[PDB]
Amino acid sequence: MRECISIHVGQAGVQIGNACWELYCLEHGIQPDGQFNTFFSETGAGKHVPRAVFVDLEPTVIDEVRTGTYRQLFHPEQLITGKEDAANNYARGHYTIGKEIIDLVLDRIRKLADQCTGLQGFLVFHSFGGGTGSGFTSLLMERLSVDYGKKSKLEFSIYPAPQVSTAVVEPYNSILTTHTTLEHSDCAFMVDNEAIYDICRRNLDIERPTYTNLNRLISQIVSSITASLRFDGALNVDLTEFQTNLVPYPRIHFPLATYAPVISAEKAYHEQLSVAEITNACFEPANQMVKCDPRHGKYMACCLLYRGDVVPKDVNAAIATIKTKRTIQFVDWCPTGFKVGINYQPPTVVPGGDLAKVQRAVCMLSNTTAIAEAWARLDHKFDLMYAKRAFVHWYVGEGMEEGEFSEAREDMAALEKDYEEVGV
Amino acid sequence: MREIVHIQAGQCGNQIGAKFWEVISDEHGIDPTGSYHGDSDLQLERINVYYNEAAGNKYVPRAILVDLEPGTMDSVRSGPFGQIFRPDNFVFGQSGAGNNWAKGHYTEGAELVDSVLDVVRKESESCDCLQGFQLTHSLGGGTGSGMGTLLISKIREEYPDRIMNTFSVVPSPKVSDTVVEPYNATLSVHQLVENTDETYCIDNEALYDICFRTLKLTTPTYGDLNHLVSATMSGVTTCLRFPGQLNADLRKLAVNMVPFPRLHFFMPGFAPLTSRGSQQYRALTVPELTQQMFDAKNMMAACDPRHGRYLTVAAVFRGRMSMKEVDEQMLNVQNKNSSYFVEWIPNNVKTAVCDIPPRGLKMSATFIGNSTAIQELFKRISEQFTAMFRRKAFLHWYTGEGMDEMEFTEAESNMNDLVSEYQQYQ
Amino acid sequence: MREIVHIQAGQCGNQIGAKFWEVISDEHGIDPTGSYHGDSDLQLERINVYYNEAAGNKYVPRAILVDLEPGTMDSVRSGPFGQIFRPDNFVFGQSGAGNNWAKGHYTEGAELVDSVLDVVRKESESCDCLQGFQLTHSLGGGTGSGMGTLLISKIREEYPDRIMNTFSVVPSPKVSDTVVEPYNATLSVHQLVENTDETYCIDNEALYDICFRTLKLTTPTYGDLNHLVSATMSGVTTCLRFPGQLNADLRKLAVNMVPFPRLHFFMPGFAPLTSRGSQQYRALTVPELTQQMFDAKNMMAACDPRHGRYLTVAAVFRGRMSMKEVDEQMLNVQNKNSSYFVEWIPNNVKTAVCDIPPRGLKMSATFIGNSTAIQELFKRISEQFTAMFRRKAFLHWYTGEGMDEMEFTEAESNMNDLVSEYQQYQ
Numbered sequence A: 001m002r003e004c005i006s007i008h009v010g011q012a013g014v015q016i017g018n019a020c021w022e023l024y025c026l027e028h029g030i031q032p033d034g035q036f037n038t039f040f041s042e043t044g045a046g047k048h049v050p051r052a053v054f055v056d057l058e059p060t061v062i063d064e065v066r067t068g069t070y071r072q073l074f075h076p077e078q079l080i081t082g083k084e085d086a087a088n089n090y091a092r093g094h095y096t097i098g099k100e101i102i103d104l105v106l107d108r109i110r111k112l113a114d115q116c117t118g119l120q121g122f123l124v125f126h127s128f129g130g131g132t133g134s135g136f137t138s139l140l141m142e143r144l145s146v147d148y149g150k151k152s153k154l155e156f157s158i159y160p161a162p163q164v165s166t167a168v169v170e171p172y173n174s175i176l177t178t179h180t181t182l183e184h185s186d187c188a189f190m191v192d193n194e195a196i197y198d199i200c201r202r203n204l205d206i207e208r209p210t211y212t213n214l215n216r217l218i219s220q221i222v223s224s225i226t227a228s229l230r231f232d233g234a235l236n237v238d239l240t241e242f243q244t245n246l247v248p249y250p251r252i253h254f255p256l257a258t259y260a261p262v263i264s265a266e267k268a269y270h271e272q273l274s275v276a277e278i279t280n281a282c283f284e285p286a287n288q289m290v291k292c293d294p295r296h297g298k299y300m301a302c303c304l305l306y307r308g309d310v311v312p313k314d315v316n317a318a319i320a321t322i323k324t325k326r327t328i329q330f331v332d333w334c335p336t337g338f339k340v341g342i343n344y345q346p347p348t349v350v351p352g353g354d355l356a357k358v359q360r361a362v363c364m365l366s367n368t369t370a371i372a373e374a375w376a377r378l379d380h381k382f383d384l385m386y387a388k389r390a391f392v393h394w395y396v397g398e399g400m401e402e403g404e405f406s407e408a409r410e411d412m413a414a415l416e417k418d419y420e421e422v423g424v
Numbered sequence B, C: 001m002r003e004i005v006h007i008q009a010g011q012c013g014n015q016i017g018a019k020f021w022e023v024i025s026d027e028h029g030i031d032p033t034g035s036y037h038g039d040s041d042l043q044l045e046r047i048n049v050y051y052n053e054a055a056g057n058k059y060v061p062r063a064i065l066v067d068l069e070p071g072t073m074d075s076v077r078s079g080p081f082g083q084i085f086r087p088d089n090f091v092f093g094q095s096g097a098g099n100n101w102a103k104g105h106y107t108e109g110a111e112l113v114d115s116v117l118d119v120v121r122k123e124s125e126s127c128d129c130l131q132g133f134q135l136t137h138s139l140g141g142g143t144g145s146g147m148g149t150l151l152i153s154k155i156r157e158e159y160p161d162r163i164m165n166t167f168s169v170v171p172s173p174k175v176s177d178t179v180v181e182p183y184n185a186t187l188s189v190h191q192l193v194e195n196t197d198e199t200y201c202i203d204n205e206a207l208y209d210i211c212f213r214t215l216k217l218t219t220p221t222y223g224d225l226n227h228l229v230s231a232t233m234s235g236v237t238t239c240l241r242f243p244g245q246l247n248a249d250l251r252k253l254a255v256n257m258v259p260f261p262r263l264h265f266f267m268p269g270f271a272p273l274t275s276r277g278s279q280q281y282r283a284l285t286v287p288e289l290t291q292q293m294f295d296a297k298n299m300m301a302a303c304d305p306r307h308g309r310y311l312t313v314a315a316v317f318r319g320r321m322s323m324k325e326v327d328e329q330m331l332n333v334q335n336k337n338s339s340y341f342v343e344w345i346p347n348n349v350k351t352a353v354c355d356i357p358p359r360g361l362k363m364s365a366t367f368i369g370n371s372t373a374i375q376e377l378f379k380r381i382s383e384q385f386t387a388m389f390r391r392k393a394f395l396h397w398y399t400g401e402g403m404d405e406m407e408f409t410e411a412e413s414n415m416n417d418l419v420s421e422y423q424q425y426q
């Protein structure tokens, strides 16, 4: 049967993973003590065990998981630990400390694969900017590529925001990650914290958020992406289809991920929440989950994942309407720029949560030239930093070389050029 | 994993250290007899970062107490938490240091240092994964300055891939506490420039300002000043000892705060600091805390931060708070006042958050600033030193211990180079 | 039919033996007083393989307990199952062996061996059809090594057409337990090469690895290690004592596992071995069990099996399982990783299955591997021995008992020949 393996790497990734697992449990009625095959590997005592890899170089987040509510759910191995974190240092992830743990991780992955009779591939959770999530993740991905080749390697990545950050070596790390996951990862789905905060401010009418809320939101999106593997419905999408439909050229593979309706209990009753409306919301500039205007960019390819009550006719109508709008610009070379997925199973509400129950929800994954601007900004930042050789002694002092940075910059430039070409 | 070894040297170093050990003890629910009386499992989970466990659920700080004279350490032992320390971890000489760096570094201290190193080695061998060393001392005396520097040199030579961080009490522009202070400070600073990964610069005048202007305290004791310093110290390592949303680390902070290897002198701050009279009058919001943090009046160095630019600042928040709010506040500060932040490093502010707040507070924060304004301190020290050295005033006390003029000139050169470097980014 | 006589010699041999007799007793439903309290007729059907019946439904193990010093056997008697043994089957001397093979083999042991042989003869006379002998000892000491070897020599001379199999605890590459270990081991191994039909090679370091890495056991006791060994031992003879789909036998295993007469040194393994924390997390499938079995981390010798090739492996499965599945798994291992199996012996894996699983498990398995990697152990021993012998270090203790240099050289020669033979098939 259809089976996939999750990998959660870092602090952020692990946090996201916790939320995801909670959501999954809520969906499939599994208790916190383990009392589906797609995600939960079943054993001979009416016990369901997640099929995930949990990795951190700092033993803190993992320790929390091990002590908390869902400790009996997880295996005592899936949760892997180290001794000291990378500390926002790609070099300490990719070269120095990662090559101590990576083997174990690989072994675990192999074991998990062995336990499956049709592994669709991988879902990986990391962060552009973090020390572990940048370098270690990259290393892992390379190894996976070497091993499996034609198994799906999907990534969920926390992109650094333009006007806000939490680390002053974040441009370097991200750039390095981009350089060394450009020839491995098939899809890298993007979420941005600033964007999420903006969404919270606007749609939810909440202006005192925290990381937990963000994680929950991310988990919803993840669930939507993966809902076709675990339930019936017209147009059952696969993990392998995304690659086919959202990657026109192999270097160009960063699509944005957005969710609608993200709305509180008060204006759920006021709104109709029809299909068309939701679709419209999905394409609105402010509702997007990154800091980019899709008015400044042409949509190459979009993928829509309707979940709940949806008459396909209505969906079609909505799509037609979207096409009609002047705006919402598409590229010349992609007329058919839509993929549609439908599930009978509705979204699931998490107790003590932000979101209310809905009849129908939609998740949109869109690959566009709007991200080019973001990339350019990042490059500029990098240039500003690297011109004075700031922080370079840390990276060079653990493995890296002067020249690698230059190469990375060149690669970024090439990517930008490609994007520009696509735009024409 | 992540054990930290503490070294406290000389009078000030031992005194501050005593207070620090008190504070940490109370945070971990450890009583003076080494017994745990906490209410949360979080209290013990990472207790190994600062403490070693012994028979009968006894916890013993990984602390090494060093002095060339016995008085101060005798007082420490007599003190409240004094009985918590391992007796074998008191290492002392018999002759004083006479506020003389040469005696601390080359002669009296040289005779004692091997014994200290042996104890250090013993402690490091008990670490599953030693993170590094924390030192507490003054820069203006003989023991903390000369002996302390010497110890640092030795340990870095033996453990060059570990973190070496110091809390260093420096002389104050108005009211010096010894006559040879400039000489001692310059001699220490020379060594620290090359042998430490980070140094927190504490100025007693700034502490007095905090006590009088901010805390409204008519009669501050050294004890009270020490408390403040201890609070700042605890802040730095909070993310090793407790859970959080953004788990910081010493190394992480170093990575984000040191853009060039020699520029590792930080101005520490702490918040909130509010008078006992005006407690109910303040609303304890993250914005207000941020404002306190960035206020020059709430800094602990002898600088006007507005007379320079911030290369990087690290903020560590403690308690429950909205990450959204924190980030927004950080953005607002930088956008509004971009002139006070070096333009070649976008996102000059790094934030960390630890869920467990210190006793008696719902929220707190610790501020660590790498500002080009620090050059003023160095420049002033250099001026003072030169004023003396050009007349070879007081120099016979040092030449008599085997030091040469050339060393002093080297020290001066280093200082000036450092100042020049700082001026570059100013 | 198919009676097995057990001999346990020296300290380690007696200790392991005690545990083995406990385990077998529990398997057969025999309590420490020799009373049967089982629930199945299968428990008694072949009880005669290990036990002798006495008046009042008493069962007495066919075990001979041998030592040159009384301490260990006094402890055994004091122990839980100690009262089950026949008092007349304790054969002991008065003077110790001083970790000295010569004392065990030529002098002290020579004085005692006739008495042991008499007991052995007496036991063999009570066998309707004696299959053979099982010996438990260490290779590094004096009694188990020297005396034990001597006994083996005697019995093979008298019963040359019976099976002679040993569980032999060998020295470990990191942490030797005696200084003369290389000498003793080499002297024993020389004799075992020519006088035993099969030897199971147990390494205490491997056991510790199993306990720490696999079982997650913070504080393993020798008792716990012994338990594991006993489990492996029981596995080997399971098919004599219970029904099955493929009824194995000692002789059958020998036939399939020894392609050349001198290559009879096996690496044993056992499965499943899982931490008490992570029990519900594992699905107990035959495939997973197979994977455990073939994992180097689950072996009990001081070898990296990946540094050699398997000449033959025998797997004995216990519990209910699909023969289809078992065969398929075996095929998959060989096809996938044909490089780790000697190419001149098609179907390198032999499988046996016994229906009745051990207590507390639905399925289990025991692994027996004849790998060319074993040469590493021998090579390392030889290196050590030569390092000493070339300086005649410690040699006077042996020459004083009448041994000559020539014997040592002969032993070395044998060892080297064995290594060369192993290298042939590598």
Ligand SMILES: CC[C@H](/C=C(/C)[C@@H]1C[C@@H](OC)C[C@H](O)C(C)(C)[C@@]2(O)O[C@@H](C[C@@H](OC)[C@H](O)C(=O)O1)C[C@@H](OC)[C@H]2O)CO
Pocket: A106, A107, A108, A110, A111, C290, C291, C294, C295, C296, C297, C305, C306, C333, C337, C340
């Ligand atoms: C066939 C004889 C045999 C030779 C090999 C290579 C065999 C084959 C496979 O097992 C049957 C390996 C196996 O499929 C796994 C990958 C699941 C795995 O178990 O491999 C080991 C490492 C591997 O050696 C590399 C192992 O030690 C071993 O012995 O492997 C790590 C482990 O971490 C959980 C896990 O990742 C020696 O007897």
Ligand SMILES: CC[C@H](/C=C(/C)[C@@H]1C[C@@H](OC)C[C@H](O)C(C)(C)[C@@]2(O)O[C@@H](C[C@@H](OC)[C@H](O)C(=O)O1)C[C@@H](OC)[C@H]2O)CO
Pocket: C117, C118, C119, C121, C122, C125
């Ligand atoms: C037939 C007449 C007879 C002659 C012989 C040799 C007889 C035959 C057998 O007994 C019937 C021996 C017997 O089968 C045993 C081996 C079990 C055993 O009993 O032998 C003796 C030693 C043996 O002499 C060597 C004995 O003293 C003896 O008299 O043996 C040790 C004893 O230790 C427990 C045990 O090992 C004299 O009357």
Ligand SMILES: Nc1nc2c(ncn2[C@@H]2O[C@H](COP(=O)(O)OP(=O)(O)OP(=O)(O)O)[C@@H](O)[C@H]2O)c(=O)[nH]1
Pocket: A009, A010, A011, A012, A013, A015, A016, A057, A085, A086, A087, A088, A089, A127, A128, A129, A130, A131, A132, A133, A134, A158, A160, A166, A193, A211, A214, A215, B245, B246
């Ligand atoms: N959405 C979300 N973002 C997070 C979370 N935790 C961290 N981040 C973001 O991730 C980035 C920091 O990377 P981390 O994952 O914390 O770093 P790490 O992978 O643990 O690497 P090191 O700590 O450097 O070893 C920042 O942009 C954070 O805002 C989380 O729980 N949710």
Ligand SMILES: Nc1nc2c(ncn2[C@@H]2O[C@H](COP(=O)(O)OP(=O)(O)O)[C@@H](O)[C@H]2O)c(=O)[nH]1
Pocket: B009, B010, B011, B012, B013, B015, B016, B097, B099, B137, B138, B140, B141, B142, B143, B144, B145, B169, B170, B171, B177, B204, B222, B225, B226
């Ligand atoms: N903050 C603080 N400063 C101190 C303390 N004790 C001494 N000092 C300061 O330390 C400097 C004197 O050095 P001291 O440590 O006493 O000399 P040493 O024993 O030779 O190292 C002066 O600047 C004093 O103001 C203390 O307990 N707290």
Ligand SMILES: Nc1nc2c(ncn2[C@@H]2O[C@H](COP(=O)(O)OP(=O)(O)O)[C@@H](O)[C@H]2O)c(=O)[nH]1
Pocket: C009, C010, C011, C012, C013, C015, C016, C097, C099, C137, C138, C140, C141, C142, C143, C144, C145, C169, C170, C171, C177, C204, C222, C225, C226
């Ligand atoms: N596994 C195991 N090894 C043992 C035990 N007792 C001793 N040893 C090992 O046996 C060797 C020492 O030989 P020992 O049997 O005590 O000497 P002997 O009485 O002269 O044969 C060493 O390698 C010990 O580690 C035991 O109970 N179990």
Ligand SMILES: [Mg+2]
Pocket: A010, A011, A056, A058, A085, A132, B247
């Ligand atoms: Mg981390």
